[PDB]
Amino acid sequence: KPWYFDAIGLTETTMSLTDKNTPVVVSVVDSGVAFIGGLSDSEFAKFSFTQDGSPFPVKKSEALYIHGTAMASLIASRYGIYGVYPHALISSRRVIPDGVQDSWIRAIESIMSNVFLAPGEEKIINISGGQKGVSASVWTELLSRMGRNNDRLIVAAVGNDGADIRKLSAQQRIWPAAYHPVSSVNKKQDPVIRVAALAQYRKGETPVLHGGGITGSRFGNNWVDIAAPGQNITFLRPDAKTGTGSGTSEATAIVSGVLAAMTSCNPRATATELKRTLLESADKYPSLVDKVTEGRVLNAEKAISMFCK
Template identity: 30%
Template sequence: MSRTTRRTRLTAGLAIATLAVASLGTSTAQASPLEEAGPLMNYVVNTKANPGHSMLAERAVEAAGGSVVQSWPQIGVVIAQSTNPDFRADVRTGLFGRFVQSAGATRTAAVSEGPATAGATTGDAAKGEASVEAAPVLDPRESEQWDMAAIKADKAHEITDGSRKVLVGVNDSGVDDQHPDLKPNFDAANSVNCVDNGRPDTTPGAWRPNGSHGTHVAGTIAAARNGVGIVGVAPGVRIASVKVVNTDGFIYPEYAICGFIWAAEHGMDVTNHSYFIDPWTFWCNDNGDQGAVQEAVRRAVNFATNKGVLSVAAAGNANYDLANKTTDNSSPNDTTPVTRPINAGCLDMPTELPGVITVASTTKTGARSGFSNLGLNVIDVAAPGSSILSTIPDGKYGVSSGTSMASPHVAGVAALMKSAHPYWGPRELTRALHKQADDVACPTAPVDARCTGTTAENAFFGEGLVDALDAVKR
C-alpha cells in the first residue's frame, strides 16, 4: 500500500469517526454532577489502536465524569482522571462505552500530583552539546570498575567506544546532565519528564533528577571517556533522560507508558528500565484494574519494539523465583499491602513483558547476587550488579547494588552492538545478546535447588553473563 493511499484512508477514517462522534453526541444527555465525589484517581482506558476509536473513547471518559489527561491513539490507550468512584464501570456504559475495551485505575492511592494541567508539554528542549571523540586512555577511576572487566567492556573499548548515532534512553528518576562524566554524551533535545500524570513535559531541565538512581544508571551505560572519573560500557553513545519516577519514588503505569511511547517516537535504539511499575509488584491479567493496566503497558512496550527500540529491564531485588509465583505480600505499595495468591498471569512489569530483556545480577566473584530475582525461561542474561561504582548527582561518584545496576550493563552492551551493527533491530539484538553471553553454570557449593536448567540456560543466569567484546566483533 502506498503512503498516499494510507494517508487517504487515515483521513477518511478520521472524517468518519468525527461524524460518528457528532451523531452520537446529539443524542447523549449531559452527565449530571456526582452527588458524592471520591478521591482523584488516574485510569487507563483501552480502545482500538486508531485515532477514530481513541476520540470516541475520550468521549466515553467525559460522559463518565472524567477528563482526558493524555491520549495515545498509536496504541489505543487514553489516560484519564476522575473523582467518580464508579468511573471504571461508567466509562463502559452509554453510547460511547461500547468503544471502550477495558479500563482500570493505575494506583490505589489518590493522585499525588493533583489534576493534570493543560499544556504540560511546552516549548522546545535545549539542544545537547556536541562532543569530540576522546582519546582511548584510561579514566582516573577505571581501575576500580571490576564490572567492566567482568563483561570484557575494557577489551571491547580497544575496538570501539560506540557510535554517536546510537541513542540510549535512561527511563528512570532523571539524569544530572551537568555531571562532567555525562554532559559530553547527554542529549537534551530528546529528553523528557513523564511524571506529570503521564504527560510528556519537555520544559528544559524537567528531566533532571529527584534522586541519585537515574544518574548512577546513566553512568554505567555511557559515562564519557574524557579523562574524568569513570567510563561507561558504551562511552561513545548518546544518552537521554526519560524521567518516569516521581518525587515520592513511584513509577505509576501512566509514567511508564509515556516513557515507552516517547522513546519510540524519538529515535531511541535502546532503553533501560531499572524499576518495576507501582503500586503492584505483580499485575495480574484479571478483568479489573490490573488486567487493563497490564494490557495498556504491553501495548506501549510492543509499540516501542516495533519502532526499533530494544527495552532492557532489571529482574528485581526480592530473591523471588519469577517462574514459580505463589504469593505476593508487598502490594499495593502506595496504600496498605495485602497478602494475595498469584500465578503465571501476574507479571512483574515491565521486566516480564514480551520483547523485554530481563537482567539478573552477579557479584564480583561471578555468583548470583543474593537479592536478585531468578526464573527459568524468564531471565535472559546476567550482568554485574553488586557494589557498582558509577556517577551520582553534583559531579560525584558512588557505589550501589541491585539488579538496577545490572540492567544498564546490558543496555550498554546492546548500544555497542547497535553501533557495530546499525541495521539490527530489537529481535536481532536480542538473539545476539543470548548467543554471545558467556555460559554460567548453576552453583555446586552450596547447591541451590532453585537453579534449574542447564549451563547453557538456567534460572539464575539465563543465557549467561553478557559479553561486550563479542558484541563489537563483526
C-alpha cells in the first residue's frame, strides 16, 4: 500500500486481529468531509460548528477545502487511498473556516454531552490542527474533565513549521496539543495524544522528524507524545483526485487510524488503557528523546497486537 504501512507494521496479520463486527466511528474535527471516492460509504454523521451552518467543506481556501477529506481518507478510505482502518466510519465536525467562537471546543462539548453514542462511536477524536492565539481556561477545564471521564481520546497534531515548542510563546502554540498539565493527577489522566511527523523511512531504518520551515514537524520533549509517518503522504481531495502532503496533520490522522483499529477489539476500554498501550508499544529511539517524549515512534503491529490479544 503506501510506504508507511510496512514501516509501522500495518500488515495483513496485524489487521486480522481487529474486530470488523464492532463499529468504530472516528471523529474528524476539521474543515468538513466530502464523502466521495473511497469515503463514499464512510459517513456516520456530519455536523457544523461554522458560521454558515454548513457541514460541508467550502472553497474559501484550497487547503481548507481539502483538509478534512484528506484526513478522513487517511483514517478510513476503502479504496483509492488506503485508510489505516478502512472498517471505521467517520463523524465530521466542521469547525473551520469561519468557525463560531471556540468552534473546536463546541465540537468536543457536543461529543461529550451525547449519551446516545455507543462505545466506540467518537471515542477517538482526530484533531489534525487546532487553535492558536490562546485564558487557555476553557480548553484546560474541558480537557481535565474529559481526562477524569476516562472515556475518550483526543489525537492532536503539534503543528507545522519546525519550531521547538519549548521556545514558542503561548500565543504561537497549537491547542489542544498545547495542553500541558502539571499536577500528577492531570498528567496521569491526560486524554490528549500529541503527534509529531516523521520523514519517510523503511522498517529497520532509524526515523527522523520531518523538517522544514513550512511543513516541518514542530517538536520538543514533554510537548510531543509520539511521532508517526508524516512525509510523502497521499490523500483524497473533494474532487476525487489525490494530493500529496507532508506534516503533522497527516501523522495525526495515521495515529487515529491505529487507535481506531485497537478500539474495535474493546470499545468499552478506558482512554487511559488505550493511550498506555499505544505509548508502551511504541518503538523507543534514543536519538529522538529531545524531539519526542521517550523517543516514541508509532508501531501499529505492537499496539494492535497488545491491545487486541
